[PDB]
Symmetry: C2
Subunit: 134 residues, 2 copies
Amino acid sequence: TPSMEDYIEQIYMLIEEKGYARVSDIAEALAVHPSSVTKMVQKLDKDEYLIYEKYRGLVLTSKGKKIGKRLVYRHELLEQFLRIIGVDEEKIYNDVEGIEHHLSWNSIDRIGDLVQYFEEDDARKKDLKSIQKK
Amino acid sequence: TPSMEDYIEQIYMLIEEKGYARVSDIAEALAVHPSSVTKMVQKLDKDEYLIGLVLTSKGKKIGKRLVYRHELLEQFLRIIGVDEEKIYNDVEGIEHHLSWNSIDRIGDLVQYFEEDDARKKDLKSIQ
């Protein structure tokens, strides 16, 4: 059962490089009853995540765009993170997948400050690799 | 509902802070039906993790590792300055979904800031 968050992420991609999002497209990528999209897209509208453009179809409001873009950011940030601390590229996605839906934006924020702490220079992120060689 | 690990870990810690682990103690902590703790404890006893409830080398080994991973992820969140109130929640939610490879590096990363307070307060200033 995809989350209101999964939709917005999904509805985001289906809009990003697929014009706009049609209720059938959702019940596709998310792989769930096409009536579960209308049931949900109903609450998404109520939550100001998207409005329905007569004739054109569903589109995200600045809010939805915001929430959606932030989700995308969370995924890449977590991957950058796992990778920057030196984790088997193979694992990166695996772990990020498992954890991403279980972390507060507070952690996602401090993890950014963490990724920051390093990325700014290849040296400081070396000492990390030096400790890893044990 | 709690997984096999969640139980092992709970059995482990309880013995840690009381020496004993009672089904009631387990059920109360995990907020589950004691009947379920019972069903679990049987599976746990058959697969020889334990036998109040006592952990065998196996259960003891796994339990200690689960607790380490737990205390480590938390300590990690605290290190990078995460709201005291959110640490446990986030950790309880991500601890299971992180490979041991990731845990091992969170470890080295948790060590990086440990061998030099100049690094702990260094990040704090960037955040």
